[PDB]
Design a protein around this ligand. Structure first.
Ligand SMILES: [Mg+2]
Ligand SMILES: [Mg+2]
Ligand SMILES: [Mg+2]
Ligand SMILES: [Mg+2]
Ligand SMILES: [Mg+2]
Ligand SMILES: [Mg+2]
Ligand SMILES: [Mg+2]
Ligand SMILES: [Mg+2]
Lengths: 169, 292, 159, 58, 70
RNA sequence: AAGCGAAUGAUUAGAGGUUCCGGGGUCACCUUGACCUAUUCUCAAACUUUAAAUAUGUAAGAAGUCCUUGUUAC
RNA sequence: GAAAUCUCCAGUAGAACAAAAGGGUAAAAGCCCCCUUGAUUUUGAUUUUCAGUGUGAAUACAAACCAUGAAAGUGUGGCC
RNA sequence: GGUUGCGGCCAUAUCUACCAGAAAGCACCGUUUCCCGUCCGAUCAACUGUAGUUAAGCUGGUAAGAGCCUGACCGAGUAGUGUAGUGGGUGACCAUACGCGAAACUCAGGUGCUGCAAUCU
C-alpha cells in the first residue's frame, strides 16, 4: 500500500534473569557476548521482597539489545529451535512478540564452557519507518493510529516470511 | 484510552511551542531576560537551527509582541557565493555564520572596524574591543534543543560568526580537535574541517575503497566535475565572496503573494457553517429514522 | 504553642491559579521598570526567591531602585497610629505595573489635547470630571409598549 | 489568678485620637538602598552638571 | 401520609407533610415526565431513569434510546 | 453562599459490562464478590473548580505634562 | 508465579523532592551522570517578629575572588 | 493563503475517532571515513539531498463528540450579606425597610488569534 508502511524488526532484546548474583551473571554475560557480539548490560533490583532471594541493587540479571541485520540472523537462529511454533499468546497488543529458549549453546561454538544450562528470553520489537518521531528530542510526537503496529499486523507479518503458525500446540 | 471528562477539565496544557516541542522555556528565560538596570537594551541571540536541507542563522531580539530579526542568513543562499553542495555540512554552517556576521555588521555600519579573522587558521579567538572605538556587537549563541557535542555543526556556525567579526562569547571545549583526555585544541584539524577537510578526505578515501558508494554519495561532485582537492579552494573563494557582498539580495518573487494566496486558497477545506451542521445532523437522523 | 513563621497563613495566598502552574511566561521578564513606576505586589508561589511578605500582597508601591533581577519598592505601612516607609526587594515575578497610573496618564494626555483645542475658542471647557448626575426629564411613549403587568403571585410549594 | 490575655478593644480609638498620619513626602527622598554602582556614577554626573551650570551662569 | 405523620413524633422540632408535584423521585413535574415518556425521551434504569438530550454523539444517542427517532 | 453525574476525602441505592480476582454450582449452569461504565441520595474548621457582601491597597497632576538638549567613571 | 529482569502502550504528577504540615516543581525543583566548593572574602541597605531595639531567619545589591556551562546565566548553603 | 525559523498570549490552541493535503517548506528517510555518543549510529554525532515516501509527523476538515472559551431580563434579584427598628417568635429562627448581590443549573454561540524574518502556483 505504501513502502513506508512496512513492518520491520526495530529491536531484538535478549534477557536472562538470575535469583542471585556472581559467576552466574558473569557466564550470563559471556553467553550474550558470544551471540550478540557486544557487551551486555546488567540490571539492579527495584526493591527487595525477601522471598526471591534478591536485595536492592545487586546486579541480578543481564540483557543485550541488537538491531538491524544481526537481529534477523539471531531471530531465525532462535526460531528454528522453536520450529516456527508460537501461540495466540506471545504477541502483545502493541505489535511486539517474544518467546523463550534454553541451552542453544550447541550452536555458535566458542571454547564452550558447557557447564550450566542457560535459559534465554527473546523479545522482539516491531515498528514501521517513522518511529523516530516518538524518540527524537525535537518536535517529539505520537504515531497515528493507522501507522501503529498491532497484534494482527504482527501475526500476519509472522505468518508470512518466517513461515510460521500461531495458536497451535 | 478512556480520557475521563474530569481528566480533561483538570488538564493544564503547556505553552504551544512546548507542546510542539520547539521552544525550551527554561533556556529561553535565561537567554532573553535582561538586567533590569539596562532598561530597554536588547539582548541579541544568534539562533542557529538545522533542518534537513538547510541551516537557519538569525540574529534575534525579544519584544512583548514577539521576536524581531535583526538579520537573517541561510545555507540555501550559499550557491550565489560558490557552494552548491553540502549545504548542511559543518563547513557550510561556518560559512552561514560568517555570512550572518558580515551581514549584521554591514547593516549596523560596524564593518569597517571589526573585520574579524580575515585569514582562517583554526585558532581560538574572540572579537576584541578596539581601543577607544565602539565595542563589538554583542550576540549570544542559541542552539534550541540541539545537544552540545564536541564537533557539532552549531559551534561551526558559532565559529564562522565569531571569525566574521561579531562578539560571541564561547569556549573552545566543543570545537573539533578538542580532546577530553588532553584539554587542548587542534588548530590544524579545526581549520581543515572549516574548509571541508572531513568530507573531502571522505570522498578521497571512499573513491579508492569502493566506487559504487562513491557514486551514490557525492554524485553531484561527479556531476559537475569537482575533485576533493578543489573543496578547500571553493570554500576559501566563498568566504571571500561572503566578505565581498554579504548584502542579502532577495528573490525577485514571481507570482506575487496575492495570487499565492489565490492559488493556495483552493486547497484548504472550508469550515461548514452552523446551519449546514444542522442540515448534516438532520440528514443523519432522517436516514436513520427512515425505517431502513 | 503559637506559630508566626514568615510564610504562615499563606496556604491559599501563595497558591498558583487553577491550571496556571508552571513556568512564568516571558512577558513578566520583558517588562521594564523605572524609578517612580507604580507597581502592584502579588507573590508568585513558584518563585521562592525575592518574595514579598504576605502583608504586602495586594499593596501598591513606587519603584525606587532597579537591580539585575529585582526592583526596590516603597510601601506605606500603618504601624500603630502612624504610617512607616517600607522598602521591599522584590524580583520582577512578584511585581506588575498598575493600570491605575497608565489610565491616569491617558486622562492627562486627553486633558492636554482638550486644553490645546479649547485655546482656539471656548474658555473654561470643563476639564474636571463630574460625579454621575441625576437624570434629565424624558417622555416615555406607549406606542407598542402599553403598560401591562400582574399582581404579586400566590404561594405554591414547588416541592 | 487569671486575667485577660489579649484584646484590641479601644486600640483604634487611641490610634485615631491623634489622627493616623501619612509619612510626609518630600522632594529629594533619601537615596538609601539604591544600587551603589548607579549612586557612584550619579555623583560624577551631578558634579558635571554643577560645572556646566556654573560656567553657563557665572 | 399517615406513616410520615407517625414518624414525625420521633423528631424534635416542627416538620411538615408536603405532597410533591414531581413524578416519584425524579426532578420532573407530572405532565413533564408524562410528555417526556410518551415521546421516548425516558429510559428505565435500575431504580431511577436516564434521559435523552440533544447533546452528545448521535451514535450513542441512537444506540441508547433506540425507541426515539421514529 | 455554592459544588460533589469537577480533583481529595466521606456517603445511599440499584442498573450495564460475563474476569485462572478461593463463587460452591457444567469438568458453559436465574442461585456470584470485586473492578470498570453511565446514573442516584447525602456531606467537609484543618476539601474545592467557582465565589460575594462587609472590610482593604494605590491614583485622581506645578515635586505635573510637553518640547529642545547639557553631565557621567554607570 | 500477584510481587525478580526484559519490551511496548497509556499515564497533569494520582511519584519524588531528609525530617511536621502547607505551598511549589515535568525537556524540573524529581532520577542518573560530569565538574565542583559561592556552605568563601569585605561593608553597608532591606523584610519578618518589632519598641520598627536585640536574636534568629531571610531578601536585593556593591567591591573581590571563584565553580559550572558552548553560552546567556546561575550560585553568598539546603525548592519556600 | 500555504510553509519554515524565532516568538506573544498559553486549550476558542487540549483530547478521541475518522478523512483530506497542489507547490514549496518541514518531515520520514540513505550511510558510518571523519568529530562525538551508545549494550545497540534506537537516541545523540557526523556525511550525502544522494536511494525512496507523504505512510506517519505536521496542517486543515468532520463530530446533535468530551473538554475548554464567551454571552444570556437562564436560574436569580434566588442564596448570601452591610445597615435599622421598644419588628414577629418560648425558642429555633423569620419577615420587613434602605443598599450590594453570587455559584450550581438551563439555553445560545464559538473551537486559536497574532508579531518578526525568509520562502512557495
Ligand atoms: Mg539547557
Ligand atoms: Mg502558621
Ligand atoms: Mg492584664
Ligand atoms: Mg458553606
Ligand atoms: Mg536540593
Ligand atoms: Mg534558599
Ligand atoms: Mg539511522
Ligand atoms: Mg438601637
Amino acid at each position: 500500500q505504501n513502502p513506508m508502511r512496512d513492518l520491520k524488526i526495530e529491536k531484538l532484546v535478549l534477557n536472562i534473569s538470575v535469583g542471585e548474583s556472581g559467576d552466574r551473571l558473569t557466564r550470563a554475560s559471556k553467553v550474550l557476548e558470544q551471540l550478540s557480539g557486544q557487551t551486555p548490560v546488567q540490571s539492579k533490583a527495584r526493591y527487595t521482597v525477601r522471598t526471591f532471594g534478591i536485595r536492592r541493587n545487586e546486579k541480578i540479571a543481564v540483557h543485550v539489545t541488537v538491531r538491524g541485520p544481526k537481529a534477523e540472523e539471531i531471530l531465525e537462529r532462535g526460531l528454528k529451535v522453536k520450529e516456527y511454533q508460537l501461540r495466540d499468546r506471545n504477541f502483545s497488543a502493541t505489535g511486539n512478540f517474544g518467546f523463550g529458549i534454553d541451552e542453544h549453546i550447541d550452536l555458535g561454538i566458542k571454547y564452550d564452557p558447557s557447564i550450566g544450562i542457560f535459559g534465554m528470553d527473546f523479545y522482539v520489537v516491531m515498528n514501521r519507518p517513522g518511529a523516530r518521531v516518538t524518540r527524537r528530542k525535537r518536535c517529539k510526537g505520537t504515531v497515528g493510529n493507522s501507522h501503529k503496529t498491532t497484534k494482527e499486523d504482527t501475526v500476519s507479518w509472522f505468518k508470512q516470511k518466517y513461515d510460521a503458525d500461531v495458536l497451535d500446540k | 484510552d478512556a480520557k475521563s471528562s474530569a481528566y480533561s477539565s483538570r488538564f493544564q496544557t503547556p505553552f504551544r511551542r512546548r507542546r510542539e516541542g520547539k521552544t525550551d522555556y527554561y533556556q529561553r528565560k535565561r537567554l532573553v531576560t535582561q538586567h533590569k538596570a539596562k532598561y530597554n537594551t536588547p539582548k541579541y541571540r544568534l539562533v542557529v537551527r538545522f533542518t534537513n536541507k538547510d541551516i537557519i542563522c538569525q540574529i534575534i531580539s525579544s519584544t512583548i509582541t514577539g521576536d524581531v530579526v535583526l538579520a537573517a542568513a541561510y545555507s540555501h543562499e550559499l550557491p550565489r557565493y560558490g557552494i552548491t553542495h553540502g549545504l548542511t555540512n559543518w563547513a557550510a554552517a561556518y560559512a552561514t555564520g560568517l555570512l550572518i556576521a558580515r551581514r549584521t555588521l554591514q547593516k549596523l555600519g560596524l564593518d569597517e572596524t571589526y573585520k574579524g579573522v580575515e585569514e582562517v587558521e583554526g585558532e581560538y579567538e574572540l572579537t576584541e574591543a578596539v581601543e577607544d572605538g565602539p565595542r563589538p556587537f554583542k550576540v549570544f549563541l542559541d542552539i534550541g534543543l540541539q545537544r552540545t557535542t564536541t564537533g557539532a555543526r552549531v559551534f561551526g556556525a558559532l565559529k564562522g560568526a565569531s571569525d566574521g567579526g561579531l562578539y560571541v562569547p564561547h569556549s573552545e571545549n566543543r570545537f573539533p580537535g578538542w580532546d577530553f583526555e588532553t584539554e587542548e585544541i587542534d588548530p590544524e584539524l579545526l581549520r581543515s574541517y572549516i574548509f571541508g577537510g572531513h568530507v573531502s578526505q571522505y570522498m578521497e578515501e571512499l573513491a579508492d575503497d569502493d566506487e559504487e558508494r562513491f557514486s551514490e554519495l557525492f554524485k553531484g561532485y561527479l556531476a559537475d566535475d569537482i575533485d576533493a582537492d578543489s573543496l578547500e579552494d571553493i570554500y576559501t573563494s566563498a568566504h571571500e565572496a561572503i566578505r565581498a557582498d554579504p548584502a542579502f539580495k532577495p528573490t525577485e518573487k514571481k507570482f506575487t503573494k496575492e495570487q499565492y494566496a489565490a492559488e493556495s486558497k483552493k486547497y484548504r477545506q472550508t469550515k461548514l457553517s452552523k446551519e449546514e451542521r444542522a442540515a448534516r445532523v438532520a440528514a443523519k437522523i432522517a436516514a436513520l429514522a427512515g425505517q431502513q | 504553642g503559637k506559630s508566626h513563621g514568615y510564610r504562615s497563613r499563606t496556604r491559599y495566598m501563595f497558591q498558583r491559579d487553577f491550571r496556571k502552574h508552571g513556568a512564568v511566561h516571558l512577558s513578566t521578564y520583558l517588562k521594564v521598570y523605572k524609578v517612580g513606576d507604580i507597581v502592584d505586589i502579588k507573590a508568585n508561589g513558584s518563585i521562592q526567591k525575592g518574595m514579598p511578605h504576605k502583608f504586602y500582597q495586594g499593596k501598591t508601591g513606587v519603584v525606587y531602585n532597579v537591580t539585575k533581577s529585582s526592583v526596590g519598592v516603597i510601601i506605606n505601612k500603618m504601624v500603630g497610629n502612624r504610617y512607616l516607609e517600607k522598602r521591599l526587594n522584590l524580583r520582577v515575578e512578584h511585581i506588575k505595573h498598575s493600570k491605575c497610573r497608565q489610565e491616569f496618564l491617558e486622562r492627562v494626555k486627553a486633558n492636554a489635547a482638550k486644553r490645546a483645542e479649547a485655546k482656539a475658542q471656548g474658555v473654561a471647557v470643563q476639564l474636571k470630571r463630574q460625579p454621575a448626575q441625576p437624570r434629565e426629564s424624558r417622555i416615555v411613549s406607549t406606542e407598542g409598549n402599553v403598560p401591562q403587568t400582574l399582581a404579586p403571585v400566590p404561594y405554591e410549594t414547588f416541592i | 489568678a487569671k486575667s485577660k490575655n489579649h484584646t484590641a478593644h479601644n486600640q483604634t480609638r487611641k490610634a485615631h485620637r491623634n489622627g493616623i498620619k501619612k509619612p510626609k513626602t518630600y522632594k529629594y527622598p533619601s537615596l538609601k538602598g539604591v544600587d551603589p554602582k548607579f549612586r557612584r556614577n550619579h555623583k560624577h554626573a551631578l558634579h558635571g552638571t554643577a560645572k556646566a551650570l556654573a560656567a553657563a551662569k557665572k | 401520609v399517615e406513616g410520615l405523620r407517625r414518624a414525625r413524633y420521633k423528631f424534635p422540632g416542627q416538620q411538615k407533610i408536603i405532597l410533591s408535584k414531581k413524578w416519584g423521585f425524579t426532578n420532573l413535574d407530572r405532565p413533564e415526565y408524562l410528555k417526556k415518556r410518551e415521546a421516548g425521551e425516558v429510559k428505565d434504569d435500575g431504580a431511577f431513569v436516564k434521559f435523552l438530550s440533544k447533546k452528545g454523539s448521535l451514535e450513542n444517542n441512537i444506540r441508547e434510546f433506540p425507541e426515539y427517532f421514529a
